[PDB]
Structures are given as C-alpha cells and as structure tokens.
Design a protein around this nucleic acid. Sequence first.
DNA 1: TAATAATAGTTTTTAGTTTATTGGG
DNA 2: GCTAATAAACTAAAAACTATTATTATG
Lengths: 113, 502, 82
Amino acid sequence: CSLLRLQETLSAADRCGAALAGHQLIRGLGQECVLSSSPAVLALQTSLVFSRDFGLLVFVRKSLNSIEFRECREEILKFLCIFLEKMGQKIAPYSVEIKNTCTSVYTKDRAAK
Amino acid sequence: YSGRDSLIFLVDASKAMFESQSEDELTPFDMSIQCIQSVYISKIISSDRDLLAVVFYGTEKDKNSVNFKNIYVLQELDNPGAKRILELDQFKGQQGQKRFQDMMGHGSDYSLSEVLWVCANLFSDVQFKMSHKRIMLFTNEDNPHGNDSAKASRARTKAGDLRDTGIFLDLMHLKKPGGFDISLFYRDIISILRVHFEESSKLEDLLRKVRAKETRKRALSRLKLKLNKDIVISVGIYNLVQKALKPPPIKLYRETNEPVKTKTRTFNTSTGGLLLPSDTKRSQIYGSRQIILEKEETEELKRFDDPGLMLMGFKPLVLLKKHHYLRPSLFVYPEESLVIGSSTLFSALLIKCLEKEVAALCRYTPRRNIPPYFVALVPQEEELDDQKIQVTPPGFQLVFLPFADDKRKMPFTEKIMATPEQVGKMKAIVEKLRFTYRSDSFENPVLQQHFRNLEALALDLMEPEQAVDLTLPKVEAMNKRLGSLVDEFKELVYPPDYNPEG
Amino acid sequence: IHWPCRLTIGSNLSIRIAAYKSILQERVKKTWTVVDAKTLKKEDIQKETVYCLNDDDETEVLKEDIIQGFRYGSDIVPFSKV
DNA sequence: TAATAATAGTTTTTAGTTTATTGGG
DNA sequence: GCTAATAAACTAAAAACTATTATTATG
C-alpha cells in the first residue's frame, strides 16, 4: 500500500550518502505523518507493523551521526509521539521492543548528538 | 558572524592548456593543477569551513545536473579534503594530463552562457550564509566566443546578469604565445593594458602556500564601562594579536580509526559506587589542619565587582615603566549597541587624551567571579598607509598593570662601566648588522614544521617539507661582516687568557 | 632564581647570562583537594575515566587502545604522539 | 486564531592538573 | 656524589556569539 511502498522507498532512499537522501526521507516521513494521522479503523493496524519494520529499519540502518539521518529520526519520533498520544494500548507488544530500541537509540550516537 | 566565501574553478578542456611553446616550462593545465593544489592546501589551513568546487568546459564528454554538453563538474562545492587533493594530483604531471585526456574528453566547443548557468546553479545549491562568490576561469583565448557574435552577446549578457547578482568573476591570465589579449573581449565581460603573452598576474601568491588560521572578526566581550556608577558606556574588546596554538588531538581507535568518546566519573573507593557532586567536598590541608569548603564559596571569593570597567583616573604616558609588562594588551573600540551616542563621547575623549597625552587607568572586571585588575587605556590614533588603508586602528590600547606581588625580587647588581671606544666598537658592529624589522617577518618554525609534516602524512608523501627557520642567525655572514671587530672588542674587554668560557 | 645560560652573537662571540623573571603573574600554590561529603577523605573518593565506544552499546575501548588523531580540513587522520 | 520572545548550538579562553626534565650533592 | 622543582601540555570548565523557535493576541 501507500504506507508500505513509502516504507520500502525510504528503506531504499537512504542507500546513498547525501543530504538530499535525508531531505527526501524526511519529506516522505512528513507525508506518512499527515496520511496515517487520520485512519478510520483499519489503516492504523497496518501502520503498526509498518512502524515496526521502519522503526527497527532506521534503528539498524541509519545508525549514523549524519544530520540527514538526524532530522528524519526526530520527525519519526515526533510522529510516533503524536501517534501514541491517541493510539490505544494495542501498541504494547511493540512498546517494550521500542523501549529496547529507544534507550538503545538514545544511548547510541544520539547520545553523541 | 557574517557570510562565507564561495570559490569556483573553471578550466577549459582543450588543447591550449596541455601544450606549451617551451615544454621545459609547465603546461597551462598542469600549472593550473599545482595552483589549485596550493590554494586548496591554504584553504585547508585557513578557512576549511567554506565551499570549493571543480568543473571543466570544452571537454568532449560532459557530466552535470544541468546536463549541458561539454560541461563536466569534477568536484561539487565542498570543504577541501585530502581525497580531493589526490583526485586532482592523479591528473597532475605530463602523464596525469595524458590520463585525463584518455578517460576524459577535451577540445570540444562550449558556451559561456552554459557555464554561467551551471555555476549559478551550483552557487544556488549552497543554502549557507555566503558573502563572496568568486569564479576563476582558466583559458588563454578571448576569441572562442568572438567567433560567434550571438554566442558572445549571450555570454556577456549572462555575465552581466551574474555580476549583478553578486557573483564576482576574476580573470586568471594564462600563457598565450599570441597574447592573452585583454581589453578585447574580457574587461567588458568580467567583473572588475599589456596583452599578456605571459600568465603571471598574481599566480605567484596563488601558488604560495600560506599557513595561517586567520580567524574571522569576533567580539571577545562587549563590556560596559561605568564612569562613576550610572554614566555607563558600551565598548567592544578585541585582540588584534592573539597566540595561535596547535589544535587539540582527536582520541580515536587504533583498529577502526573512528573517534572514541570518553566519559569521566567520580565515585567511591571502599565501595566503588558511582558518586555525585554533592558527595564531593573541597579540602585544603595547611600545616596539620584541614579546612573544608565547597566550590561556590571558591568562586564567590573571586566575585567582587560586576563585569565591566571602573575608572581609576588619568595619568601621563611617561609615568609607566617600559619593562612593566604583565600580559599581552587588548584593543578597545566604541560600541553603540547597548549605549547609543557613546561614539561621540569616545571621539571626544580620544581627542582630549591625545591632546593631554594622558592614558585612562581603570579597574577591569572581565566576567562574573573574576578579579578586577588595573588597566591603562592609551590612545591609539588611526594611521593610514600610502594607499590610505588602516594600518593602525583608531581606539585604545588596554595594557595590564602588574601588582606589587606580581613582581619578583632579584639579587643586587652593581654598575660597571665601559670605555667609550668599546661603545664605538658596539655601534660599528650594530651598524654592520643593522636592518629594519617588521611584524610580518618572523613566524613559528615549530608550528610550520608540524604543519608540513601533517600535510605530508595526509598526502602520504615519502618525505615532508622542511620548514625554513628565520630565527637561525647566519653565523658565517655575521662573522664576515664583523671580522676584526669581534676579537678587537674581546681584547678591549676580555683578557686574552680569560675567555668568556672558563 | 637566575637562568644560567649564554647569549650568543654569530659564531665568534658569547657571554654567560643570568636571566630573571622581574614581572611574573602569581597563582595560588594550594589546589582545592576533593574529599568525601561524610568521611571528608580523598582516599575514599578516587577517580577514573572510561573510553567506551560511541556505539555498540558503549563497548569499552581498552585504555591504551585509544590513539590520538587530528582534524585535517574536512578529514581526520589517525596520528600518534610518537 | 498566526506574532512575538527566551532560547540551545559552535568557538575560545583559562584554572587546575599532569611530564619529565634539567640541576644539583 | 643522592636525589627535586618546572613550565607545557593537558584537561575541565565557564562565558559570549550568533541562530534559531513556543508563545500569546486576536478571533
């Protein structure tokens, strides 16, 4: 789907080392934010596994102090926050995983920046 | 803070620069290659925080985001790096040029409108605060667009538009045996009478490697000098001279070369558990008794007056001892950001103190919890050189007055005179050794050697450049010019058996 | 205290010298020792530093495994003190 | 319903260490 | 003939300098 194809493109879009890659990544992230911010009852559940893959996706792929990754990561975090603000406890299976990621996110190069 | 400098290099890819009438001399292509190497080394040393790019025109092939034929960007606008240096050096030499001609075209036609378009696009790609947009062309022919009148017309129209958009084009003379032929196609097209069979306009300085940090203009602190308690004036404090120090090293791993960060912890000994600053107690043992205090009292005992300047009075410049020096002086300029109108009063006081030859002594407080020292503000009148450029800024020289406990006592030394003929011998020796000194005559050879080694290892050279030390006296020349005088004065003073060394 | 050395002029003149720092900035000769907040002992409160990797869950780089480098324009080159 | 205002992010000293190194006896 | 600081280089550490960016204000 649109969410899935955008996730795949962003998983690709970071293949090259250039600030333009980060620009297109954050643009796609902004579109995903404005898109999945308003699901009906169903697209949220697809976005759950999409966020799983894309969350851990950047967690293990970006993994670089390059700012081009930094703005994308911070926008991802903002979207995740505004999502979980009104999302329900259904995200709980991911949460501890996200927890196991989040501190690992922060304690890693995020600590250096 | 202000804008930065953007530099563009555009060499013609043709047959002219790969050939010369005297092959013993350097081909225009290759000499431009050492030129760009030298300027990139200087930029690395000085202002590596700016943008540099490489692009060629006239090549048979092409590569550019604008997709103009015969236009090939070699390097995008970027901070210089050793990878760029080696990428340029592999084409250096009378074999690197052949390589370049092998996997890279040259000699095809071009459009100056096209190169202006691509360079304008490249400059437009930069989203940072710029101040200078300098473009350097490398060709020795004003004809190639004079051949096509429409081409010359559009080229000069685009050049005028670019120069009106703040772009500065400067001309690099190239060795044309028939003559560079300026004033025919260039001064009417470039942003600004010998036809220049040669090439050297200022290429000598371009090839000249420069080792200087050249920190941009900045304010150390804008202190606010109080006259008595309320009539207070904003001033700017700078250091026109400031010790240049070696940049600190970078802790990195000896198996991956990446910089490894370090974290530092204060903790227990009996338990070893990590502790807090609240657990830390300042202690000082005098005699046998230990006094316990904390940091806050330590800086508060250094906090007496607010950051600023407190006038002590006025004193003629003669009442200061020449040997009375403590720390390098500062420069003080009027400031109208906090207090508006202070420039008028600064001019008035500068005029009055220059007329009265009296410096202003003040109590100086640099920042919070800082000791207020004594500072003498000598007038410093502006001086202009032959070209009327400021060689001495107008303002004040802020020197430091050492305290009584800032001076050390010496064993007493008696006075022993010398014969006036020995004084004449000294005067003759000095005259044989006299010259004129300038502040731009002597550098730090240690730092220069450290640099040369740094670039040599960065460039993986088999050998580093040797720094020329000007602080080594030429003993042979000095002895040649003195001759008799040395041992004449020796016999005048030192006994023949009593050499200076026992 | 004096500085026992020799001024030199060319390669044929030298005079022994004894230099003195007439003007010298003063500093406190007693540093602020740190002790415990309870036992008031420096012995119970000692110090260490840690060189752990910026990544890989802060894996500890061995103390001597660190080697200094230097900033070179847009690049950083490893460069030991030796 | 949409404008302003402290505000943290790179340099740069500089106080307190840490190095062995000459200078003696 | 019996050991003796020392400024340099090294840190931390603290402030000034641009450079932004929620925030009501109003509706």
